């Protein structure tokens, strides 16, 4: 059964990484990388188990709970152990394969990726993270830096992905419109099923989603005296005013773009979007969706601010 006592940890580290460096599931924003190197006593045998613990304030993916843990593999890719993840205990239990009966003096390394829990850590702060391999812990202080909005003139916006449902092939995006609570004249918000640059220009060929009349779009108004979580992720929409039906006659669609006519505003809004995506021909994700806010300055010229999210698996 459990052979944690026969696992010696050579080195284990925790850091903040960039999501684009998680090759198996690359994404915008940051993540936590746990890199562990350990030796397996020769006494360990097939079907024996070891554990790895995540920090209580991280989640292996904050987009879905359906993935299995990655295997422990050698440099050639032979499988040393297969894992199962228990959400309750935030622990992986790894079961050694026959690899540990056929090889001796085994060393192994693993990198596990995770996300700060945005419900537990809704705003920027520093905190201590603690992980463990085979019951041996290490700790690391990290600073959590969430993104800034993109700001041009009165145009100011930010977005993140929040929920992937691979059964229905949908992605959820949460967009903050005017989080700075500016007075924004003739505001238009686009949602495009492609990457968008910082000025709202569509950049086709960098991932996609489908944005059309069947995309679910909900819109919430934020009061002057409400501050939005810096994490960009809302867990409880009941605290905001659902104004979705006010947009029934304010939406238009053209060539995989939705436009919402906000008009003259002086408040922040939250848009929650659920859109369909299309897996690639070889069974991977190549998801990208962007948003932009257009406002009119006092001289009648337009300012645009864009934001874009992505998930690309391999």
From Swiss-Prot:
Top-level division of the source organism's lineage: Bacteria
Subcellular location: Secreted, Cell wall
SUBUNIT field: Interacts with host complement factor H/CFAH (via C-terminus). Interacts with host complement regulator C4BPA.
Chain's role: Cell surface-associated calcium-binding protein which plays an important role in adhesion and pathogenesis. Contributes to the resistance to killing by innate immune components in blood and thus attenuates bacterial clearance by interacting with host complement factor H/CFAH and modulating its activity. Also inhibits bacterial opsonization and killing by interacting with host complement regulator C4BPA and thus inhibiting classical complement pathway activation.
Membership in a protein family: Belongs to the serine-aspartate repeat-containing protein (SDr) family.
Protein name, entry field: Serine-aspartate repeat-containing protein E
Taxonomic source organism: Staphylococcus aureus (strain MSSA476)
Gene that encodes the chain: sdrE
Parent-protein start and end of this portion: 273 to 586 of 1141
